[model samples]
Target: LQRLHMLQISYFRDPYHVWYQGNASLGGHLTHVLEGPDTNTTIIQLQPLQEPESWARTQSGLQSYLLQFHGLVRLVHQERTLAFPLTIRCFLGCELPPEGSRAHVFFEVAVNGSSFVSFRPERALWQADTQVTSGVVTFTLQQLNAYNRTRYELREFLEDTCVQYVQKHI
Candidate 1:
């Protein structure tokens, strides 16, 4: 039987990467795990539901990218802000991946379009059914995918119970 497991980011420092603040910096530290083009998994070009819109016009219509997954949890830094632009929307797909494959636990998203991209909540902002629209977003395609040695539970990273700690942090 298939069982769901929490996505685990390895807890130890890697020879190729380092844990600085909340960033998992890869070799040479040029890019972040949070950045795109993960060496694993392949994706395809985005087929526009319609042609790209003009930049000069006030966008009457919006474009969307729906990221569907089986297990979904977001990881945010307690002390820092997000570096990437927020995405349009996210959804949960009912089907499960093959047995023993952990790939489903990770999602690699590459956002393209005008420099201005925004994620709007379709229903509730926190749930999977999110919406992403760009002041000028259509997008190009890309493939993407992480881990460490020293482990931290999800709760450990939550906003601290200490009022002062929580007040001063993200």
Candidate 2:
């Protein structure tokens, strides 16, 4: 019971299960990050990065985000949730669309697998070298709410490319 394996296998405190625990799962990862009457942010806890994966190979290759929010009509009970974009428009040193290129399989989620919110382009088509994202971007909380007028979540894709150099090049 002193190791992570014991806790994960016996206690069910696994990584993927926890990250998958979102706003309607009786609780979510960002519930603690909520602030004021708007949105909130949290570091996306991910499954241990597999060293052999396509992106996990480099420090800057890991591209992902995680967040949660809650709202209320007169209290926090009334909640609206939002998530960051599935793909990055621009980054410091990761991957990007080929100008007109776009991603249809960009990240998205469905509460209880019933409703789906997609961050990808509406057409689900990428016109290579068509759209290039700016390093900086924005999102709102109010617009992301379930019934509110405004609520949003910030989708940040950061590359720790520097880590690879330290481990390999350095």
Candidate 3:
């Protein structure tokens, strides 16, 4: 049996704006990697947001999400002003084995090099890393669950969207 994996890494940095004061612009890099028993490839020629329209849409959405996340962090830390140059790292991927077997998908989020949270597609839940002990995690989880849409979207991406992408690559 051979297994193939397709993964994407999205690295985001703060954009210096009054909305979310920082030093760098609201930009990041998206890198894709494909791995298999006999193949390993890194794709850089095709960027996901190369088109101007798509880039704008993606940037707008990401900017909003980051603003919300920053607010949550500030509230948790009880700080009137958040430090500049915040960065977020997202990893999402799917594993595909020769047909007849189950596929697995995963999504993880990290903040400034620390593991923050991850999604469990099988259970449709988000959980903080075991080593993290903060009310922010609990609050974030509750907020995500309460919204319902975010949770559903995450599960759909992991179980369906990511799997399809991996299948096409393999």
Candidate 4:
């Protein structure tokens, strides 16, 4: 069995400037920086897993997703009058067996280092962390829905994209 994980961190100071850092790991080993604002032209890989052409293609999709999420964050910040230097962190992954049976997928999101929400694959709902305020969580979820990132779509990414990458690396 192999465990694959993708962690993405975004730091937003303003609408014009958002810094993103992504790291992907397989079986507990640091693979590479998926992409970063300062490291866009220099993606340092600790271990190469896929062909350059395919990885580049993958990065493009990932980049657009991050940008869209950043837009949502910016809108929320402006409307709510939230603090500056907001940070959004996402952790998602799956467990893959050689035969690809009974795999488990998980995804979680945090803001400013506090747990915000997570996806429950079985329940198919974005459950808010009990520690956060309900009003904040409710509004964020509403915004996400307006952005077209429904729970079903997020679950698909974890089931499809996450599993596909794990299989590729393994």
Candidate 5:
């Protein structure tokens, strides 16, 4: 049996400028940033931005969120287990909910097929206009004994989590 590997991918997004609005409203084709526990190793990787089909375009006439990043946990275990915990702490840019607006962070995991798991990141809120908030979300997987399947599935889930957040917020 393949040893269960605990994969972690974490990164954050910051506004390209101090004064910026939503994703589409912002401009200049500037690259956004994402930080994770893994920096430039195999565990951390970058995938090309997905082309947008929606009429939604940035001030530069491009899709929202210029840069997308990914990371994976490298822990390996001999047996299936959910003992490993995963966390995502992201610092989003100025394009966020206005002052006094309530917010909740979401962390997700994709499992076999279209099924997935999602959990709320605990603690703290800035409650501000164009806020630079630091928040985290976490969850544990059950029977993490498969390697490639789990990593691929988790990668898909992470991408969905970030993209969906942009869609809803922008």
Candidate 6:
């Protein structure tokens, strides 16, 4: 018999990737635990927004090369600017390998015919996914994936509504 062990999780970040504040040196760093391609696990945290219900308006507009064991929660705590934990327990089918290597996965996720997340297996493409078409968003994971990259893709998919909205709009 399996019993449910409940754990409460509090998140300190919003979903969107806010570039370093106008070339400011520090990017708010929050930590997260990720499952790698070969079932390896790693923990990393990055800075998140100060509040939810007031973050990016693109929640549910996410796309991932692969996503599994997804979950979400919302809290009614005294703090009004927090977003509850959005956790997961799965790895991408085609997640990247370790770092310091080159890989590329050519895929796209878009909103209003504009790409927001584009996957290039390698570390070269700076501004990708911003050009993916509304009809063709292929989340690809080619050579190796960094800790936060996969997290970004999955998070965006959950926070942004590109899939549904684009489907209807197109």
For residues 32-91, could you state the per-residue lDDT of candidate 5 as single tens digits?
322322222221112224444332232122111222222122221222222233333322
Order the candidate numbers by TM-score, best to worst.
Answer: 4, 3, 5, 2, 6, 1
Q: Pull out the clashing pairs in model 5.
A: 7-73, 8-72, 8-73, 15-93, 121-137
lDDT string, candidate 6, 1-170, tens digits: 11111111122233321111101011111222322331222222233421354223322121122222111111111222223322222211121224513211233433233344544323323233444333212222221133464555544442232233222322
lDDT of 1 by residue, 76-137 (tens): 21122233333312111111234633212222222222122221212111111116642222
Query: C-alpha displacement of 81 in model 6, angstroms?
Result: 11
Q: Which pairs clash in model 3?
A: none
lDDT of 6 at 89: 20
Between candidates 1 and 5, the lDDT winner: 5
Model 2 misplaced regions, further than 4 Å: 1-76, 79-105, 121-142, 145-170
| Over 4 Å off, model 4 | 38-46, 97-101, 122-124, 132-134, 145-150
The CA lDDT at 42 in model 1 is 23
Best by TM-score: 4
State each model's CA lDDT, in order: 0.20, 0.22, 0.51, 0.72, 0.28, 0.26
Model 2: per-residue Cα lDDT over 1-170, one tens digit each: 00010000001122112222221000111111111212222212243333445333322222122212221111212232223212111211222323524211232323232222333323222222213332111122123333322212222221122223223321
Q: Of the pair 5 and 6, which is ahead by lDDT? A: 5
lDDT of 3 by residue, 1-170 (tens): 22223332332233232222112111122232322211122222234523577445644544554555545555544533334455455565566655657776676777667887888877788888748576666766666555555587668756775566445533
Name the runs in model 5 displaced over 4 angstroms.
1-30, 33-77, 81-95, 98-100, 123-170
For every model shown, what is its TM-score relative to the native structure? 0.16, 0.24, 0.55, 0.80, 0.24, 0.20
| Tens digit of per-residue lDDT, candidate 4, span 1-170 | 58888888877676556677788788888886755563352355576676888877766766667666766776776766566777878998888766755679987999899898887864557777756476567877677554436566777777887778777777
Considering summed lDDT, which 10 consecutive residues are worst modelled in model 6? Answer: 17-26
Q: How many Å off is the CA of 26 in candidate 2?
A: 30
Which 10 consecutive positions of candidate 3 have the poorest summed lDDT? Answer: 18-27
Clashes of each: 13, 29, 0, 0, 5, 36
C-alpha-based local distance difference test score of model 3: 0.51
Report RMSD for candidate 2: 15.5
Candidate 3 wrongly placed segments (more than 4 Å)? 1-84, 98-100
